[PDB]
Amino acid sequence: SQIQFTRHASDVLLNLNRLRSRDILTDVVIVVSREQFRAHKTVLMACSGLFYSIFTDQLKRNLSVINLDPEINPEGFNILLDFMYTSRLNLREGNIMAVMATAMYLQMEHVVDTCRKFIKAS
Amino acid sequence: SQIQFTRHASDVLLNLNRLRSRDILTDVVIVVSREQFRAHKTVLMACSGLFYSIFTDQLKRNLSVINLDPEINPEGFNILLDFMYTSRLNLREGNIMAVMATAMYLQMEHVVDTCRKFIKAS
Ligand SMILES: O=C(Cn1ccc2c(=O)[nH]c(NCc3ccccc3)nc21)Nc1ccncc1Cl
Ligand SMILES: O=C(Cn1ccc2c(=O)[nH]c(NCc3ccccc3)nc21)Nc1ccncc1Cl
Ligand SMILES: [Cl-]
Ligand SMILES: [Cl-]
Description:
Number of domains of chain A: 1
Bound molecules: ligand 7S5, chloride ion
Oligomer: homodimer
Protein name (chains A, B): B-cell lymphoma 6 protein
Keywords: immunity, inflammatory response, transcription repressor, TRANSCRIPTION-TRANSCRIPTION INHIBITOR complex
Strand content of chain A: 5-15%
Subcellular location (chains A, B): Nucleus
Organism (chains A, B): Homo sapiens
PDB class: transcription/transcription inhibitor
Distance between the termini of chain A: 44 Å
């Protein structure tokens, strides 16, 4: 019965990315080797099984700094964080493996599934 | 060049609504007459010119309680908050006027514009 705004979700995500771009209401720093990335936990939780599981745990939910696995590649992480906030995944031959393995670690199964299709599409 | 996930934004919004439903990482209470509504400021800012303007102001950005104009109808507010988090607007003859006037106050111009089309479509 309700009216559907078909661009509203993407508009929200776009604005949330603009907020990240300005460091407005970001509440966590993700450290990946020597790089740091600020983000909104709510967005992370919405997009990643690893961050969902971390922050739903009232023991961890107020963490302000998350140190990721040192083996994780920051470029892979950065590509996935961009994806979270934009719905666009920058998959390329030079990065498919680091992205796929990072998406496995972050428990982003649709992305991993898409990464497999990409290998299969060559 | 990048791969577009066409359902990702709506999936994010759906998960953010589930987080609200569980009061996970909500950081503001909106008081409207005798009713209270918890929400995420980031979502509010993304969807409303009034909340954007309030919370971008470093003077107001850490407010945990916002008292809205007492004349605002809580049902109208509640319909608009649901819309923010779902992209579905529950517009009905019994509520078009309270929704439109609430959307004016919250500076949700596409919604106001849509409310006018609704009156014109009768
Ligand atoms: O679903 C998410 C995060 N997420 C995104 C893709 C994706 C994924 O592929 N596998 C997982 N495995 C862990 C898990 C599985 C089901 C629900 C929750 C977590 N998790 C993912 N978060 C969420 C769920 C329900 N309510 C609010 C929120 Cl924020
Ligand atoms: O646009 C919004 C909020 N919003 C949603 C619909 C809507 C609206 O119809 N009129 C207004 N008038 C005030 C305004 C006008 C332009 C930008 C910002 C505020 N504001 C709206 N927020 C935002 C913008 C840029 N970067 C990050 C964010 Cl969160
Ligand atoms: Cl801030
Ligand atoms: Cl919480």
